Amino acid sequence: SKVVYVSHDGTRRELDVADGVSLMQAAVSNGIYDIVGDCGGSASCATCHVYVNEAFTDKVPAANEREIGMLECVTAELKPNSRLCCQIIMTPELDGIVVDVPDRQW
């Protein structure tokens, strides 16, 4: 799956995340999330606060309401399509997913 991460300054990182691998997982293989994780990626922290293109959010496993309550626990501007990068699984069919990461991931 083609995985691009859009930072703030406009710089991007294109990876290859296989099926079942979460963006937070491959970000550790290319050295991108190098910031440790509180919920260890178990959907329970705002460490992976990022904005996923509203084109893959309704296609990738949109977690039930358990996250919708955590999404209301970040320090950055939430978005209708906000998402906790760890609770996401990439797939070759969803190749081209664009992720937007803010300066305040908290």
Binding site, annotated residues for [2Fe-2S] cluster: 39, 45, 48, 86
Cβ proximity to ligand FES: between 3 and 45 the closer is 45
Question: Encoding tokens for residue 33?
Answer: 């999330």
Could you tell me if 3 and 14 are in contact, meaning their C-beta atoms sit under 8 angstroms apart? yes
Nearer to ligand FES, 15 or 73 (CB): 73
Nearest approach in angstroms of CB 37 to ligand FES is 4
Identify which of 1, 20, 34, 17 has the alpha carbon closest to the alpha carbon of residue 101: 34
Are 100 and 49 in contact, with CB atoms under 8 Å apart?
A: no
Binding site for ligand FES (CB under 6 A): 24, 37-39, 41, 43-45, 47-48, 84-87
CB nearer to ligand FES: give 28 or 43.
43
Query: What does the alpha-carbon distance between residue 95 and residue 3 come to, in Å, rounded to a whole number?
Result: 7
For the bound state, the minimum distance from the C-beta of residue 36 to ligand FES, rounded and expressed in Å, comes to 9
